[PDB]
Design a protein around this ligand. Structure first.
Ligand code: NAG
Ligand code: NAG
Ligand code: NAG
Ligand code: NAG
Ligand code: NAG
Ligand code: NAG
Ligand code: NAG
Ligand code: NAG
Ligand code: NAG
Ligand code: NAG
Ligand code: NAG
Ligand code: NAG
Lengths: 270, 270, 270
């Protein structure tokens, strides 16, 4: 009889609708689980002067100077002189140890990325009773933000956790190219971080044998390129799109069901 | 006449429907071609002890010891002593050469990433007739998995292809920070790999001139951060979503066609 | 009265439709703002011979030779001999300085990635009055494309801007593993770039004290793996999908409105 076939068609269509609802729910759940990553790049005419927190310890800073695209040859390596850059010395308790006080030398970083500005730092360590001598350094976004802060100690403690710290060793020239990566936390706040490319070059020590005891650290900081990399977690689970899909599919199924009923009626009539 | 205009409207709507079907098919084909990448991060309280397969050759292991956040100064570099770590020596044929047998020293890696655990290894090579002396090392996920295996040789041969191997040279201290990246192969299997950040520091050789002939390798392994990076290939080509779009568009086109016919009839009647 | 309730229902449904249109427009605008990144990998049986533009300056090239998976020990470091590779010397004005003419030594790179082909280069610098001695190098895709070009000078000037240049220093062996990353610019053009992993190994100088003045550069170029990484910016803003969603939702809303009117009529009648 036609009635049983029509009822079976209705049941099949309702089962298809239920399965489609299940599939849409599972897809929405899956897309909530895994947001997709999108990467863009931002051109900058001038970077904001980064803060370079150096942790020399007993290593005295011989020289710190800004250069453009090239470093003039050293007049006399291992000798103090030519310190033209803004520096701030800070003492702050380590956020993790709570016992070791860190003394940091904050140096204002380069700004003209287009002009290939670099900052060159020369340190000397004299008679260190410790093999594997290296200087720690941390990079943060703004030196001015460090200056115009009410709690510089708290700012440095926050930097200890927000940013990563690297090292540069003596007997080398360490060339550091910096890059800014800003990650959107889809909450109105963006986390900025530094990615640094390091190249070490041997230092040709032409000092007298007596002066070989003191060891020299050379480090250069510049920007890799005038591109800030922005990383955003795009959500592909839109409830309105899902409900629009469901509504359209339900309307299609209802229209198909009533077309089937009309076709059955037409077959019965003729 | 109104009939010709209505038939032309029907033909235009059917052509639009066909073009929309073509566009949807092309979009589904394109989305099948290029799945989108999604990156997430996993917090870990404790890492599973990684296996560090070292290939020293004739270089004897002076020392291997676990430290926390800092390495105590060497009592006497170049002298054996203080070997507290679990190691396993293995001999296995190279999967690619089929002739060169590799002898590997498997070392259990650090676990407490939160406590900044590191493993410090000191090797000595005495009178090597080969310039550019370096030790190969490979990283795999679990030392325990290596232990509780029926074919350790086959496990090492599989590691030779699954993981990448790096080198650390003498006259340096090589600081290696490890990171785990798990890539989903959308097939029920996930491929795990190691990404390592390497920083070399000069070793200040304060040995007697006689002892300068033997060269020393210092390497440190720890974890960069308590974050495992998961990378998944999300497919954006859902056949059910595409068929729902097509059904909704077809219903819209049919309803618009019958509205147009009704409007033509209303214009004719009045 | 039922009429006021029905009119209020119609107004509510039209407001819902307007809000849904607003949401769809905002979603389309957002998806236009941020295309999603998709990463794939391409297997290669043989790479196209890359061009390695070396900038030695006064450093003479002692040796340049192709090896497979291993470098034979040096017969006599610091001595010329065994130069078997195709090289081209070029002079071109620096695109940025417009005054400094760069002299480049273009070397044909390795091809058999499967066979682990590498190219080994040995340079010597004799009595350089400049500390921090290093040689610049740039990588571009094809040496043949450099050969079969009408303006080699213009090709090199374009490479100065299209590709990135690194350095390798004396007193080391610099192991460079190359990788090709092709980014689709969604405009019919793809930008190819080189990513290089560098490992430095100490050179054990066993030369006489007289010969220690001349400094030696050792560099190796090979391919990291037979995988070319393709990065594409997929656009998730399809106007046809959006209009299909809107049409389906509008049909659903109209059908719901007429169902509501019919239900009100049925309630009034009985
Ligand atoms: C340091 O640099 C500033 C930059 O304007 C310059 O005015 C000053 O003379 C420099 N210092 C010395 C000692 O020359
Ligand atoms: C910071 O610490 C150093 C030693 O670590 C000390 O010489 C210096 O006086 C301290 N600074 C202040 C402001 O107390
Ligand atoms: C470390 O110091 C902080 C700040 O003074 C304070 O919460 C407490 O003394 C310590 N916190 C710990 C041990 O978690
Ligand atoms: C190293 O020499 C510098 C030069 O003045 C001096 O200030 C410093 O106290 C010396 N340190 C040691 C440990 O000799
Ligand atoms: C090695 O470390 C274990 C850790 O518990 C310790 O018990 C043992 O005494 C150490 N070995 C020596 C020789 O002290
Ligand atoms: C592994 O090889 C080394 C030499 O490469 C050899 O001394 C050692 O005995 C071998 N191990 C076994 C278990 O045969
Ligand atoms: C290499 O050794 C394997 C395992 O013994 C075996 O398949 C065969 O001898 C070689 N395979 C090659 C050459 O493909
Ligand atoms: C190097 O010295 C160690 C110290 O005992 C010794 O075991 C080894 O055989 C020596 N090797 C050579 C090549 O002299
Ligand atoms: C350089 O390599 C080619 C490769 O076929 C070889 O024919 C030639 O003999 C080599 N040069 C010398 C001097 O052996
Ligand atoms: C390229 O420049 C070098 C010096 O930088 C010079 O010796 C050489 O002759 C120049 N080449 C040509 C073709 O002029
Ligand atoms: C640099 O040289 C180019 C090419 O000869 C020419 O446009 C002009 O002389 C300079 N361009 C500048 C300074 O922008
Ligand atoms: C260095 O030695 C090489 C060897 O022939 C010679 O060609 C070159 O002119 C020398 N340079 C200097 C600056 O002595």
């Amino acid at each position: 009889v036609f009635s049983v076939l029509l009822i079976f068609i209705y049941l099949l269509l309702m089962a298809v609708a239920v399965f489609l609802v299940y599939r849409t729910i599972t897809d929405f759940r899956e897309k909530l689980k895994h947001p997709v990553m999108s990467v863009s790049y931002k051109e900058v005419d001038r970077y904001d002067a980064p803060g370079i927190a150096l942790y020399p310890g007993q290593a005295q800073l011989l020289s710190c100077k800004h250069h453009y695209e090239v470093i003039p040859p050293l007049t006399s390596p291992g000798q103090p002189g030519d310190m033209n850059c803004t520096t701030q010395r800070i003492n702050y308790t380590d956020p993790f140890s709570n016992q070791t006080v860190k003394s940091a030398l904050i140096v204002q970083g380069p700004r003209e990325v287009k002009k290939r500005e670099l900052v060159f730092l020369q340190f000397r360590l004299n008679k260190s009773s410790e093999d594997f001598s290296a200087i720690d350094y941390l990079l943060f976004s703004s030196f001015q933000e460090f200056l115009q802060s009410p709690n510089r100690v708290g700012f440095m403690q926050a930097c200890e956790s927000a940013y990563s710290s690297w090292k540069f060793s003596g007997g080398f020239r360490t060339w550091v190219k910096m890059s800014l990566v800003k990650t959107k936390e889809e909450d109105g706040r963006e986390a900025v971080e530094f990615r640094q490319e390091t190249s070490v070059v041997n230092y040709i020590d032409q000092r007298p044998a007596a002066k070989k005891s003191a060891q020299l650290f050379f480090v250069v900081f510049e920007w890799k390129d005038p591109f800030i990399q922005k990383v955003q977690d795009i959500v592909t689970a839109n409830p309105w799109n899902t409900i629009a899909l469901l509504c359209g599919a339900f309307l299609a199924l209802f229209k198909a069901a009533e077309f089937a009923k009309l076709s059955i009626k037409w077959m019965i009539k003729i």
